Amino acid sequence: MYRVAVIPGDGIGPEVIDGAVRVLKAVTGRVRFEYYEGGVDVFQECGSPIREEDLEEIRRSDAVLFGATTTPFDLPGYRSLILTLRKELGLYANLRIIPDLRTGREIVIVRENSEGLYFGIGAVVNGRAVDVRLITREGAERIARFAVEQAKARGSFITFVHKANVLTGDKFFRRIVREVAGEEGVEVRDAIIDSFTIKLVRNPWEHGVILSENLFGDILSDLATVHAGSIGIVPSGNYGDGIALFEPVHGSAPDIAGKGIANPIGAILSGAMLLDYLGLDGSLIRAAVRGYVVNGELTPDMGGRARTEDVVRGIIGEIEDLLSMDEVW
Amino acid sequence: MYRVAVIPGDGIGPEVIDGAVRVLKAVTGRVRFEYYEGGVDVFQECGSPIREEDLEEIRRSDAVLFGATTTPFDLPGYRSLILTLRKELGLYANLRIIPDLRTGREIVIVRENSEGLYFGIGAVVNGRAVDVRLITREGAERIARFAVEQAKARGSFITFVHKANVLTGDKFFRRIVREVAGEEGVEVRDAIIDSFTIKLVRNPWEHGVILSENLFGDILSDLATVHAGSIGIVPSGNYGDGIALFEPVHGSAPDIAGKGIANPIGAILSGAMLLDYLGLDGSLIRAAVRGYVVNGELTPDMGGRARTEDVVRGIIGEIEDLLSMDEVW
């Protein structure tokens, strides 16, 4: 079997992960799911958002499936569950796919996931505060390789977004991205972070594999979600060398917790990316979602009157259909 | 008289500045304009993009009016004309107003203009590249004061955009922004840089005075231009303690240089901000622009068949009308 660690978190996390897990269970019985707590509650007890013993099991697992965690600004000493898991598990590539569910068109973003302004070197001293945007040869080389694999697989190109005129680290990063994409026969268009925002809202589908430094990726990937029903359908994967973690790009939405109306699509499509990573069949889930969405009642965030459970049940419906065929004939 | 230094630059710079200067001359005869070269041509000769002698006159001038300069990525040692002028003249506040010309609704952005990732400390050493995002008490205090004056004058509030969870310097910056806006009775809503991008494209007009660190401001202010005809109509001012500089937010658009079809509105509205700064009457220019735009033929970037000259002539038309009245009756 495959061992998958599951961290539902809080807010709508549990609800959408219930949805995703149930969809996964409907496409394969080859995955054992083990659940773990994490977040503020665990921080309160042990001073970390994930227990050391739980963290050890998690890294021995084959993949991780993650919901959403509330990160409060007013909790001294708290570090993000997801940032913690990203660093602890070596998760250097963050892939976000923003889908137009009708057409199957995709905005594909590769966000470097381990350095940049997230590296963690920061200080206040004598009324001067500082943060160090770090780019390393190792960080840039592997995030570039990863982006070229995505471009190769899609018979596509890379759009490297930066601000090289102002940032030494982006001049560096750009040169390395160009080296490795040369070696591998991939085109690299470049784009400046400010003007690209305009291009991203106006001409969404013409950018291939978008690549960028961590914080720029964080910004651009939220921005790209405007081209989808709601941020509620957008999935992602965080990849490292021996393990990966999958989470919807939405967050806790505590406002709507427990009201039975959260959108499980993003988590479901994330369980899809998880199956791909394991060598199982995520294309099934994707087809199920496309198909349910033609005439299915959608959740309120997408302008519909449907409940979470209705959407889950409906997608499982489409799966059972595709599944009961022999490759589709 | 007022002495105004004018730096048309290259590309469409000269064309739109010709437009702006002609509009200024139609509302006041109290401004003497002196022209100066700057950019790559001057860099080629003297190794700086502005001559030291020219720079000295410029700082003795009352204000500066600036077009657009091409900053090529492949010119070793070249620093931006505008970045150079920003640092040399002490221009710490950058105000960008994105207007909906029909309604007179405005997205108002205050971009800190002297530090952050623009401070200039960067290095490559041993396959590690670095840039230092610097926030100082002095930088944050004065950019906050400036933002509160804009909120006070509009009977409005501040939206401070940041990524405090990840950036020490934003935790600092946020506390100082909150201090000074408390002292002055201004509300401070806050927003996270990633999720705010969604809010900015979806709910543009409900954010009051948006305030942020330099690079974040650079990004957000380009993004905000999607809510306007084209980036072509958007103006700005760069303010310091003894002088200010005004430029359209668009750039060189060399693609369309010399073709007689550039949009002079952004420069014109920037000449408006310049008149306000001098205590002259920029509201005139703004009314002229609103009025011309009701039925006037617009330039191709706004979906029309008009030439630069037509729009300039038309706005001067509206000015002459408003001007020939006694405060409007």
Ligand SMILES: O=C(O)CC[C@H](C(=O)O)[C@@H](O)C(=O)O
């Ligand atoms: O809880 C946090 O501060 C992390 C949020 C996290 C990030 O990458 O910054 C989230 O914004 C995301 O895009 O994954």
Ligand SMILES: O=C(O)CC[C@H](C(=O)O)[C@@H](O)C(=O)O
């Ligand atoms: O020529 C340059 O690199 C400066 C461009 C300048 C900036 O603030 O980065 C421009 O993008 C702007 O928004 O003013």
Ligand SMILES: [Mn+2]
């Ligand atoms: Mn984010």
Ligand SMILES: [Mn+2]
């Ligand atoms: Mn810019």
